[PDB]
Scaffold this motif. Sequence first.
Motif, PDB file in Angstrom:
ATOM      1  N   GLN A  15       0.863  -1.216   0.000  1.00 12.56           N
ATOM      2  CA  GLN A  15       0.000   0.000   0.000  1.00 12.56           C
ATOM      3  C   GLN A  15       0.886   1.249   0.000  1.00 12.56           C
ATOM      4  O   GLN A  15       0.818   2.071  -0.888  1.00 12.56           O
ATOM      5  N   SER A  18       2.765   1.308  -3.332  1.00 11.65           N
ATOM      6  CA  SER A  18       1.870   1.702  -4.455  1.00 11.65           C
ATOM      7  C   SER A  18       1.741   3.232  -4.511  1.00 11.65           C
ATOM      8  O   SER A  18       2.270   3.874  -5.398  1.00 11.65           O
ATOM      9  N   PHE A  32      -6.010   6.224  -4.777  1.00  8.42           N
ATOM     10  CA  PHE A  32      -5.315   5.087  -4.100  1.00  8.42           C
ATOM     11  C   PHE A  32      -5.236   5.356  -2.595  1.00  8.42           C
ATOM     12  O   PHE A  32      -4.855   4.501  -1.821  1.00  8.42           O
TER      13      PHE A  32
END
Length: 33
Positions: A15, A18, A32
């Motif tokens: 996470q 990313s 995101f």
Amino acid sequence: NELDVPEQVDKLIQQATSIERLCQHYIGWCPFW
């Protein structure tokens, strides 16, 4: 949770990883987060 492995702590790296390359391309605001 069953097995005792840092599989959860992983998703964080993914996470956090990313967003770094996914949010650095566009504007600080990214789908995101």
